[PDB]
Structures are given as C-alpha cells and as structure tokens.
Amino acid sequence: SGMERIKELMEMVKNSRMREILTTTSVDHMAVIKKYTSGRQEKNPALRMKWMMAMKYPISASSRIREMIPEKDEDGNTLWTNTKDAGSNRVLVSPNAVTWWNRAGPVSDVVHYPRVYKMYFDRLERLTHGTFGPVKFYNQVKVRKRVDINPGHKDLTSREAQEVIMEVVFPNEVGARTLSSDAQLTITKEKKEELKNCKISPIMVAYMLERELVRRTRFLPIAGATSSTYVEVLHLTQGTCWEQQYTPGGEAENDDLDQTLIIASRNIVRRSIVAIDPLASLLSMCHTTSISSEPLVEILRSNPTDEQAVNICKAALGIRINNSFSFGGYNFKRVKGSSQRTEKAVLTGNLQTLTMTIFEGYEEFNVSGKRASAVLKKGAQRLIQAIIGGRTLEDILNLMITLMVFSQEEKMLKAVRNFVNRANQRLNPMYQLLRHFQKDSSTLLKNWGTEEIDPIMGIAGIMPDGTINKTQTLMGVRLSQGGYSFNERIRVNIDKYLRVRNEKGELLISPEEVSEAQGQEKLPINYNSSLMWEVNGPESILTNTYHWIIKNWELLKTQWMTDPTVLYNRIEFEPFQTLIPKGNRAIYSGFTRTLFQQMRDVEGTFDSIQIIKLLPFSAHPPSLGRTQFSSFTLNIRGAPLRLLIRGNSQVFNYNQMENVIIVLGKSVGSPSSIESAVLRGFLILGKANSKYGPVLTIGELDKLGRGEKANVLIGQGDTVLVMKRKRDSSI
Amino acid sequence: IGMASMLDAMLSRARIDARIDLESGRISSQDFSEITNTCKAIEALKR
Amino acid sequence: RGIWKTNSETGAQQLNPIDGPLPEDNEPSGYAQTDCVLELIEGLDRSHPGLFETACQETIDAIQQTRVDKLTQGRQTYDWTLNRNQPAATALANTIEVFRKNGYKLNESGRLIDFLKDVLLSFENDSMEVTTHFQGKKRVKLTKKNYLIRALTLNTMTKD
Amino acid sequence: AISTHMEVCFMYSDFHFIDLEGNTIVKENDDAMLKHRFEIIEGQERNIAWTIVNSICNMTENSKPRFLPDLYDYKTNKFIEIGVTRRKVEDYYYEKASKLKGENVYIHIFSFDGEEMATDDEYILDEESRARIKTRLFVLRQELATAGLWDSFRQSELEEEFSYPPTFQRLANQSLPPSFKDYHQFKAY
Amino acid sequence: AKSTDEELSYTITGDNTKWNENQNPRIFLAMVLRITAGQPEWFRDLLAVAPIMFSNKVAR
RNA sequence: ACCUCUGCUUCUGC
RNA sequence: AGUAGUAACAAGAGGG
Ligand SMILES: CN1CN([C@@H]2O[C@H](COP(=O)(O)OP(=O)(O)OP(=O)(O)O)[C@@H](O)[C@H]2O)c2nc(N)[nH]c(=O)c21
Numbered sequence A: 001s002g003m004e005r006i007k008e009l010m011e012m013v014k015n016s017r018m019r020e021i022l023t024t025t026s027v028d029h030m031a032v033i034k035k036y037t038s039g040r041q042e043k044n045p046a047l048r049m050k051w052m053m054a055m056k057y058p059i060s061a062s063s064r065i066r067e068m069i070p071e072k073d074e075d076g077n078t079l080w081t082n083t084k085d086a087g088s089n090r091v092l093v094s095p096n097a098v099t100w101w102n103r104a105g106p107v108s109d110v111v112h113y114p115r116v117y118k119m120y121f122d123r124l125e126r127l128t129h130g131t132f133g134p135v136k137f138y139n140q141v142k143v144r145k146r147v148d149i150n151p152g153h154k155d156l157t158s159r160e161a162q163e164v165i166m167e168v169v170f171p172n173e174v175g176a177r178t179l180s181s182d183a184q185l186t187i188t189k190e191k192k193e194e195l196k197n198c199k200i201s202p203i204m205v206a207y208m209l210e211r212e213l214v215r216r217t218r219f220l221p222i223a224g225a226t227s228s229t230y231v232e233v234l235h236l237t238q239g240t241c242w243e244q245q246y247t248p249g250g251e252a253e254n255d256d257l258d259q260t261l262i263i264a265s266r267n268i269v270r271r272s273i274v275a276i277d278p279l280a281s282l283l284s285m286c287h288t289t290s291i292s293s294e295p296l297v298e299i300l301r302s303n304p305t306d307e308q309a310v311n312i313c314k315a316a317l318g319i320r321i322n323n324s325f326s327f328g329g330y331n332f333k334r335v336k337g338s339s340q341r342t343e344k345a346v347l348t349g350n351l352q353t354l355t356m357t358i359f360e361g362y363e364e365f366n367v368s369g370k371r372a373s374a375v376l377k378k379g380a381q382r383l384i385q386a387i388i389g390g391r392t393l394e395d396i397l398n399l400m401i402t403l404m405v406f407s408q409e410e411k412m413l414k415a416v417r418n419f420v421n422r423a424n425q426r427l428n429p430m431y432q433l434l435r436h437f438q439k440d441s442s443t444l445l446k447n448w449g450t451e452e453i454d455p456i457m458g459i460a461g462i463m464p465d466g467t468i469n470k471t472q473t474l475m476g477v478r479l480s481q482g483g484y485s486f487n488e489r490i491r492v493n494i495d496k497y498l499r500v501r502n503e504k505g506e507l508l509i510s511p512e513e514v515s516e517a518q519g520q521e522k523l524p525i526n527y528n529s530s531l532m533w534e535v536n537g538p539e540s541i542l543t544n545t546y547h548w549i550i551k552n553w554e555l556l557k558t559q560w561m562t563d564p565t566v567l568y569n570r571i572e573f574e575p576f577q578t579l580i581p582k583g584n585r586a587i588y589s590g591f592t593r594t595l596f597q598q599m600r601d602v603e604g605t606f607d608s609i610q611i612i613k614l615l616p617f618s619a620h621p622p623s624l625g626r627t628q629f630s631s632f633t634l635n636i637r638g639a640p641l642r643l644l645i646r647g648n649s650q651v652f653n654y655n656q657m658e659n660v661i662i663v664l665g666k667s668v669g670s671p672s673s674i675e676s677a678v679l680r681g682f683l684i685l686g687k688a689n690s691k692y693g694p695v696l697t698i699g700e701l702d703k704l705g706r707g708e709k710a711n712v713l714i715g716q717g718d719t720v721l722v723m724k725r726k727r728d729s730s731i
Numbered sequence B: 001i002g003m004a005s006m007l008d009a010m011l012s013r014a015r016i017d018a019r020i021d022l023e024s025g026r027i028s029s030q031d032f033s034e035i036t037n038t039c040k041a042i043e044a045l046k047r
Numbered sequence C: 001r002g003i004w005k006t007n008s009e010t011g012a013q014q015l016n017p018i019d020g021p022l023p024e025d026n027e028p029s030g031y032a033q034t035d036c037v038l039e040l041i042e043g044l045d046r047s048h049p050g051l052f053e054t055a056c057q058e059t060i061d062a063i064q065q066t067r068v069d070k071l072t073q074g075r076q077t078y079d080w081t082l083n084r085n086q087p088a089a090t091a092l093a094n095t096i097e098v099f100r101k102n103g104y105k106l107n108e109s110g111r112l113i114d115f116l117k118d119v120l121l122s123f124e125n126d127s128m129e130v131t132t133h134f135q136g137k138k139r140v141k142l143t144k145k146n147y148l149i150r151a152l153t154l155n156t157m158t159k160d
Numbered sequence D: 001a002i003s004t005h006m007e008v009c010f011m012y013s014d015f016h017f018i019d020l021e022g023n024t025i026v027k028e029n030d031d032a033m034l035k036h037r038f039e040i041i042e043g044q045e046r047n048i049a050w051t052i053v054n055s056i057c058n059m060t061e062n063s064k065p066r067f068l069p070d071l072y073d074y075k076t077n078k079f080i081e082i083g084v085t086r087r088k089v090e091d092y093y094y095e096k097a098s099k100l101k102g103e104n105v106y107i108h109i110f111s112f113d114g115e116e117m118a119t120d121d122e123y124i125l126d127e128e129s130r131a132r133i134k135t136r137l138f139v140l141r142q143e144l145a146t147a148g149l150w151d152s153f154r155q156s157e158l159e160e161e162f163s164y165p166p167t168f169q170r171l172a173n174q175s176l177p178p179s180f181k182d183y184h185q186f187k188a189y
Numbered sequence E: 001a002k003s004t005d006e007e008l009s010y011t012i013t014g015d016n017t018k019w020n021e022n023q024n025p026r027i028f029l030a031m032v033l034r035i036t037a038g039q040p041e042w043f044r045d046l047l048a049v050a051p052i053m054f055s056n057k058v059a060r
Numbered sequence F: 001a002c003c004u005c006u007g008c009u010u011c012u013g014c
Numbered sequence G: 001a002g003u004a005g006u007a008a009c010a011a012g013a014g015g016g
C-alpha cells in the first residue's frame, strides 16, 4: 500500500521543526540523532525494577494501547493512563494491561514462529528426542578450547550472512553488490519461501537469521565431544566429578562423523603399536568401539574417508581402500617415488619462524576433484610441474592454488603477507597457508615467476593472472586435459605390525606414517575395550594410570618386591607408553628398573611415592645406558611435559598438607636421608658439604669412584652429597 | 548510508514503491494518484 | 622532582617528570625515562617482526572506514557544550551541532576522521559560541582559552 | 557537464506518459490519470538510485546492471545511458558501448550541433522530443560560445591528509620530554 | 618447557600501585611515535593527538 | 497555609 | 535522635 505512511510524512512536514530536521539531516547523520537521548543506561537495573514494580504504572507502552484495550478491567484496575513517558509519545501503563492482553487481547496466528525461531525450537527438538545413559563418577581434566556453540549454522562469514539477510528480508535495499555463491543463493531461496507472508517484526527475523546463519564459538572447559550439539548441553553432560552419558536427538554432520572416525582410528593404531600383537589388538578395538553407539566396523565399511590410520583399520577388516589422502578437498594419490617427514624452521613472508613438517623426496601425484584434476610433481619443497584440467577455468583455479601451497616451495613461504590463535594454541600450518593464498593469490603469482613453454601444440598455460597464454605460463604450471580408475578401491593385506601391502606385496602404509597429532573427537567415542581406559584422552591416560596404581597399591607393592618383571609387563601400563617418545621408551625403562633394583638392594630406603611415580616408565624391554636422567618427557597434546625424577613437578607432585598425589592438577588419592632411586649407581646421602669439594653437574659424576662422595646440582636448585656405590645393581 | 536528506530519501522511496505497487497489482490507480500527489505537496511545502 | 612550565594556550601549570632524576626510594614515582621506554618498545619490535607494521595497516584501514556514529557507543561523557555529563550519543550530537553553527562541518562526510579534523580546526576559533538556558535561552561566547580548557577537560566523580 | 547531462535526462522524460491501456503518449499538463513513461535515475543519490534499480529489476526479474544508468523505460523495459559530447557522437558511443560491454542498456548520445546516435540507429523517443534536446544543446553551446566559455568547456568533459593547525602544534610542542624544543624534533629523535 | 631441570622457578602474584597516577602522556606519545615508525606522517600525527591532549588535560 | 512536579538525571569513566 | 562514615541522608524543586 504505502498509503498511511506518506500521509503521516505529509503531516509531519507541515510542522516547521520536523521539516527542518528532515531537510537538514542526512541519512548518515540520522545515525547520530536516532540515539539522541536524555535517558541514561540504568546502572543498577535490579534495584530499579524492584523499586518500580511497586508503582502503579511502571511500564511504558505505545499510545495506541489506548484504543486497543479498555482503560479499566473487570476488577476496576486502571490498565493505561495518558501520562507521556519522558522523551516519547509512549504512555504509562500497569502490568495489569499485559495480563489483560494475554487473556483477552487480539489473537494472532503463529505459523511463522517455529520457522523464525528455528534456532531455539531445534534445541528443544534435540532434547525431546535425546537419550540418557548412566552417570559415572571420575576426575577428568577439562581443557579450555574454542568450540562451536550453535548447531544448524551455514558456515557463512558475517559479510555473507548480511548479504543473504538483506536479500531475504529487505531485497530492494541491497544496493549494487548481489550474491556470488550458490550456497548463498540456495539459502536465500529456501528462507524466502519459508518466511513468505511473515508478519513478525523483520528486526526479529534478521536478528534470528543472523544468529542462525553465522558459526559462533566460545572458549569453554570441555572434556568430551566438541560438536555443537554436545556443547549445547555441556551443563547437563559434564560436572567436576561426573559425566552424564547422553545422545542428542537428530543426525550428526558427516563432517563430525568423519573427523571422529579419523581420531578413533588414530587412537586405535597408536594404542595397538605398543601391544605384543598389534593387529590382534587393533582388530579387537575395531570390533568393540562405537561412535554415538554406531559400531566402528559398520562406519569403516560404509565411510569413504581415505586416511592412513583409517586405511590401516579398513585393511585389518578386509575393507577395500583407496590408497589416497585428502588435502584441501581434493583426493591425492601418489603415482611414483616417496619422501621423508622432516621437522625444520621456516621464515615466511610475514617474517616469522614457524617450524612444522616438510616433505622431502620424489613424489608424482594424481589429484582428482569436484570439477578438476591435475598431475602434480613434487621433489623437496618443489613444484616440478602441475598440469591442471577441469570444466571451468574457475575449477582449475582453486586446485591451481592448492597445489602451489601443497608444494611447500620457498616462493610461497616467502610470499605470505601468525602460527597460533590468541589463546596461543598452535594452528594447522599447511592448511592456513592455503586459506591465506585463497582470498589473495596476488603476491604468490607475481612472486612465482613465468615460463616460456614450447609450441608443443597442446600444453597451454596460465599466467600470473588467471589469463591463458599460448607459449608462456607460470613456473611449472600447465593447462591440458585428461586425468574413474582413480576412485577404484583395492584389496590389501596387513601384517602383524600394521604394515599394509597390495596383492603384489608392495608397502602401501606403515603405522609410523600415521599423524602423531592427538586431536579431540567431535562425537563421543566409546572403545568398550580392556585395552583402553574408560575415560578417553591423554591427560586421562596420566591421571587414570596413577589413580589405578595408587588404588591397587598393596597388590602392586608386593608384586614390586617379589615379582618385578611381571609387574613391569602388566597391560595397564601400555596406554601410558604411548605418551613416552618412541626413542626414549627403552632407556627410560632401563634407568627406572635399575633405580628400583638399587632401592631393593640398599635396605631401608623404600619410597612408595618414588615407585608409584616412576613405575609406568618400567613397561618397555629395557636397554643398557650410561645416561643419567633428571626428568622423563611425556607428550601431552603436542607439548612436552617433563616429570622430574627427584621430587615434585607440575605434572606429578605429592602435597604434604592434603596428603594426596596431584597429577596435572587432579588428586588421584594417596597410598633416613638416603635416596636410592634417583641416580643410577649413586646414593644421595643428604645436604651437600663444602668439606667434600666443589659442586658438579650430573653429567660430570662420570668419573667418580666406589665410596667417593661429591656435591651435585641434582635439580631444582638443590645441592646434595652423593656417593658412588661400592657394588652394583644389574637388570 | 547517504548524503541525501531524510526527506528526499523518503520521497524517492514512496514514488518508486507506489509505481511497483501499481504494476504488481498490489495498489489501484486511485491510490497511486493519491501518493504521487501527496509527494508533490510535500515537495512544494518543502519550498 | 620534575620541571614546571606554564602552558602557552591554557596558562596551566604543567609538571614534567620525564627524563627527570632517577627514583631514590620505593615510593611510587613518575620519573619514567624516554630512552628506556624506547629500548623496550624496540626490543618488542625485534621480538615480533612485522607486528607493528601490520597493526598499523589495520588501523589505517579502520581510520578510512570508520563512521562518525562509532562515537555513539560509550557511557556518560563530559559535554563541553553543557559543562555537564551526557550520554555519548547526545554529547556527540551536541558537539556536531555547535561545531556546524561555528563553521566546522567537514564531518558532513560522515567519516570519523573528518570529525577529528573539525576538532583540531575548532581550536583556532577566536570565539566558540554556545547557548545556555538562563536561571529561557541565551548565546554565550567562549574565549579561545575557555573553549580549549573545556576541550581538554576530564569530568570526575567517585566510583561506587 | 553535470547540469547539462542531467537537463537532457530530465527533458528526455518530462511530459511523457503511459495510458490506462498502455501506449506511449506526450502531454503538457503532466497530470492523476496517466503514469510516467520513464523512471529518472540520474540526479538521485547513489544509494537511492540503486534502490530504484533493484526495485525495478525485482519487479521484472531483469538482471541488474553493473553501472548506474540514467533512465529506465516502462514501455520498452530498457535501461538508458544518455551521453552528451563536444567531439564525435560517432566515437563517444563506442567509448561507452565498451564501458557497458555485456550490459543490456540502450545508449543515446547527443552532440551540441544537433545530430545524435541511439542503439541500432533506432529511436524509442519521438522526433519532436529529440528535437527539443538537440535544440537546447545548440542554444547552450550558443550561450557558451558568445559568453567565451564554449572553447573552455570543450577541453574537459588522493592520499589522506591530517596535519596540526597552529594551536594544536603549540600544544604538541609542550607535550614532550623536557630536552626537546618542538614536536618535529621529538618525532625525528 | 624452556627451563632446565636444575632451575628454580618462582611466581610473583603481582599488583602495580598507583598505575593511573604514574603513567605519563609524554611517554605514551613516545610509544605511539615509535610503534608507528616508518608509517605515513598523517597517520602518526593522528595517533599522537590523544597523548598530546592527555599531556594538556585538566580535571573538573 | 495551600498548590504543582520529582524518587538514578548538575553525580557512575575505561 | 537515627542512619551512616572521610560525606552525605534525616525530602528537593517550583508556584502562591
Ligand atoms: C603438504 N602435504 C600434505 N600431505 C599429506 O596429506 C595429509 C593431510 O594433510 P594435513 O592437512 O596436514 O592433515 P593431517 O596431517 O592429517 O593433519 P593432523 O595430522 O594435524 O591432524 C598429511 O598428513 C600428509 O600425509 C603430503 N604428503 C606428501 N607426500 N607431500 C606433501 O607435500 C604433503
């Protein structure tokens, strides 16, 4: 219509003030005058409301209330007055007016409410159809992470959501820029259809659409699954000392499932490699494990994920594999050659040390895709040459960039224009270098170079542009055609130690190639296995192992005294082994068992805390070693923690005052001057003594002799009198 | 966003809205008259 | 223990402890040293190659993009036009209005930086004119000095 | 150039209507029975102009132009670029048919002499109507010529700045560590 | 991680006394000029305004 | 002695 | 008086 609004305007413009304002206030300046006010933000709203709710007319309502409801109700209550609220034409009304309206006012229809407020109603749906398992009690470290908080988002940026909401709610006010993406367009169609004829305030529609469309996150202490449908009920599923097992109603994302499958498979592989029979152990865990009560076996049967650990599990189960990995949404299959993982430091174009892994060796790569394909060659941080094809030039673009990133070349390293987030958590390096060069090739292409390709009337070229050129191109870039048999899944076999070979006997995958990254599952994994602690996670491997030792201490102690080697070999210590760097397991064991023998040998120097502390490190065939250790390294979420041999550390300490052992900050309960189990082949006697010569490091005790007592900087600022023992202890 | 006055912005909106209203069926001619007329009065009263 | 000067524009007595004598006890002291500050900031630049440059480039982009109305965000603000506190938006409105009446209106662009330009240029005015309501309404002409003192004023109150 | 261009535009449309049935018509009353043939886009503030463009495109499901046109015709359902030039109607057309390459806009150049050029040497405006514009242009070039200003007109068709004015400069000079005499010396240091 | 096993480690639970009353506008002017070294002079001067105004402030 | 208004509004920052 | 606690309330403002 537009009938009454223009009449109003006419009316207003009759008035001189209003005409002046309307004629001398630009659209920009309207933003200022819209907020012009004498009213201030209430500094104590709780008090003010308590005060005002005692008053007859504390509520301010549109003046039209006066024609919409009676002045008084059946009971004699005045419902509205003609007093203008300060600064507006709203009037002062009673709360009785709100109730009146709610019993006797104009009934509306609410067909759009579920659709506009879908984000909210969906929460209730997921709960109404959720299932509760039981409550378990235990201590678990809840690590603070950024996590998603709104299920059902469309993964739009704030720009793209704005653009979409403008098209949906206010199409004629869009301006010049209209929607690129097909994701944007298909959302626009749907929403336009769902919300047609909608008479709810477009403010609420836009507000809700914005909340719903944009992925929002938050930093929270979270122990379990990090998916948004789990985050949403964190208050219900997780307490300080408890877990309420629960499954929300509705379907999981395929992305969350895939991600969890990879985490599960890696955990299983990593646990299995440290068992006496890895394949037997992996198969066992494959057959007992579930993700959200789905058997892992079924998932592995029907899930297309190609990943090293996943493929090891598939191999074990007789499932055919595609011996490929994904990178940036494109499937990669190495044709010929191989390379080597190497940890080295890299100065980028930002001017930044960032020391993640490199691939170093000859590797031919066939790369399938959505609408594109290519034949990338790679040496050591080299793009030996990438011939790319596709339906559109566009589809050749995405993959073009992806492949320059993937090369690891110095020309893309020194071409970027940080390595962590704000919480200082390390981020994905060879995926972020892609994200950057995604929305800005500019520098890369004009810092890559060009090439003068021969007439060879077939192999075209792409320039530092996107343009096509005849007998020039980028450094090692081509545009040709070629690329069904890439997707064919092959039958493989797998040996006791998880080596995967094709039917011709060629090595496809080895457990050591499996990424060492300890991720966090988006969905709950239940191993249901005697080989895995009931409580998942590396922190929990630590707390559970020590908790278990302590609670079984009487048995374990007598086993320590009578039958050491059986104790060392117990299966409960194998998960803990996965936290110890592979290269240290044997020497750490050797060191530990020797210290334990010295404790046995030198009577009256028993120490239960020292035994408990070091015991897990005994669980590996020991090697002979000279090396003295002041600490053992554990790797917890990609970061070394050091457990000190002598006394308390941040990782493991005994607190006198509580009389409890605290492990990564969690209590796991509790069970002469001579220390028999700190140095191999020495005793600590007590306080250092100037009347026994100067202070040596540990690594200078080297050349002492039986009976010969020194002063040592033993650790954490202490100096102690040691003595090289007269006899030895053997293992 | 705009340097246009609030009034000039509203006048131009009313005119174009009344036209599309008409040539969509939403509005009759004896409305579309009334609006475009009202607009011209505002236009002159502004003068 | 610093140096006193009289400000040429406001006449204010101004104490400067910087590069003053070094602290001689553990009492709170304001004798910060320019060269020591600069050493620390340089050390930080060294430790974070490219950080200052980037942060600067983001600020330049923001300066270009920022609208006058950004200043509508805020709580109670000293309003030199009233010599009283007001909500931020009202204080902004008042300054804009009094500016334009006194001939400063680069801010008509709608960009924040143009309002900032107006602010500095306002200090050249011989006689900024405002209106009081006598205790009604009345035109008041501020001396250049009066206006500058108000522009540089913090209002104070106690924290509850 | 801005006044000229926009005058042409305004002449192109003023006193031109559509019926109750819907046939192009001219009129001198310009009045609540008929409807304007053209939407005038030129002269509108950019944001409002885009609002008008969008509204029209949404009504017709016409695709939206990359550039802001000068008019839209509710009869032929075309957007319209007007042009005015001292040089060659010949060449200034293909200068703009370039700019608008891929677009779907009727072009219509006018020289100051009189002679003009539309799309497909086909006119959507009447002879009498174009007459007035051609005439007006010449009479302007005449008023330009005998004023001394045609010869001028026929030859046409930044880093951010922020500095301190005097008072603030003096304040800056007095905001330094005590050994410095002025702000520029301090900034150099 | 960065320390050796032989090092002591202590933590000061720390508070600054008279923070507001001892920081100086002139020092922040120096910080802003240094941080913005090499940048366009218009931007540097723009950022320097706040510190300069604070150096010249008065309290009601 | 009456009448009228007011109950965060000369005072709450970042 | 009392509340309070480094300065306030113990009605204020306006009209007549
Ligand atoms: C850059 N890449 C990527 N890539 C393989 O592709 C896999 C997936 O890449 P990614 O994004 O780093 O994922 P991933 O390593 O699984 O991540 P994480 O282990 O942190 O969970 C890598 O683990 C690696 O095996 C490579 N393989 C070879 N041979 N050469 C290369 O240059 C590269």
Ligand SMILES: [Mg+2]
Binding pocket: E015, E016, E017, E018, E019
């Ligand atoms: Mg303090």
